[PDB]
Amino acid sequence: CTGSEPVDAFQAFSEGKEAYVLVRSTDPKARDCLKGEPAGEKQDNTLPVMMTFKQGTDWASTDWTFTLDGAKVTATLGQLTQNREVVYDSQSHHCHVDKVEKEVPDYEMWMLDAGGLEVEVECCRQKLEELASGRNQMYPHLKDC
Ligand SMILES: CCCCCC[C@@H](O)C/C=C\CCCCCCCC(=O)O
C-alpha cells in the first residue's frame, strides 16, 4: 500500500482540478456530505476552495482559502482557521488521509467522488486505521448526499 511519496498536498488534490468528498472522519461534528471543490487556479501558494455540505435537509456552501506548504494545508475563512497535514496519498491521488491538528486531533479520509481504483481506496482505509487505531469512525458521505 505504498502510495505517493513524498506526500504533497497539491498533488494529493489532483493539482486543484477535482472535487473530493469526505468519506470517513473520527470527528463527531464532521459536516454531512462535506465536499471540497476548487474555485479558481492556484494563486501563489494558495488555492481557492468552496466547501459544500448539508445541514439537516438544507444544502450550504462556504468559501475557503487553502495555503499549501508541502503536505501541510492551512484553511481560512474570515477569523476561522483549520490546520491539517495530508499524511497518506494514494498512488494515483484518488484518495488521501489527513490529520486535523488541534487539542484532540482527528483524522479524515477524502476521495474523488468518482468510482474505480478500489485497491487504492482500501489502502487509504488501512492507513486511516493505522493512524487512528481505536477511534470510532463516522461516514459523512453516507448522509443521503
Ligand atoms: C481542493 C478540493 C478539496 C480538497 C479537500 C482537501 C481535504 O484534504 C480537506 C482539506 C481542508 C478542509 C477544510 C474544511 C473547512 C470546513 C468546511 C465546512 C465548514 O464551513 O465548517
Residue numbers in the entry: 24 to 168
From the reporting publication:
We have recently characterised OmCI, a 16 kDa protein derived from the soft-tick Ornithodoros moubata that specifically binds C component C5 in solution, prevents cleavage of C5a from C5, and thus inhibits formation of the MAC. OmCI belongs to a family of about 20 tick lipocalins that sequester mediators of inflammation from the host plasma. OmCI is the first parasite molecule described that specifically targets C5, a member of the C3/C4/C5 protein family that orchestrate the assembly of the terminal C multiprotein complexes.
We present here the atomic structure of OmCI, determined by X-ray diffraction at 1.9 Å resolution; the OmCI construct studied here is the double mutant N78Q/N102Q that allowed expression in Pichia methanolica and is termed pOmCI. GC-MS after extraction from a pOmCI sample and esterification identified the methyl ester of ricinoleic acid ((R)-12-hydroxy-cis-9-octadecenoic acid), C18H34O3, as the major product (47%); minor components were identified as tetraethyleneglycol diethylether (21%), palmitic acid methyl ester (21%), and stearic acid methyl ester (11%). The most likely origin of the ricinoleic acid bound to pOmCI in the crystals is the medium used for expression of the recombinant protein, as a sample of native OmCI purified from tick salivary gland extract did not show any ricinoleic acid, nor significant amounts of other ligands when analysed by GC-MS (data not shown). In the pOmCI crystals, the carboxylic moiety of ricinoleic acid faces the solvent at the opening of the β-barrel, where it forms a hydrogen bond with T85, and interacts with the positively charged head of R54. The rest of the molecule fits snugly into the L-shaped pocket, with a kink at position 12, where the hydroxyl group is hydrogen bonded to H119 and D121. The C9 = C10 double bond stacks against the guanidinium head of R107. These interactions, together with other hydrophobic protein–ligand contacts with the side-chains of residues F36, L57, G59, V72, M74, F76, W87, F89 and W133, account for a contact area of about 280 Å2 (as computed with the program CCP4-areaimol). Given the good complementarity between ricinoleic acid and the central pocket, it is likely that any physiological ligand(s) of OmCI will be lipid or lipid derivatives bearing some similarity to ricinoleic acid (e.g. a negatively charged head group, an unsaturation at C9 = C10 and a hydrogen bond donor at position 12).
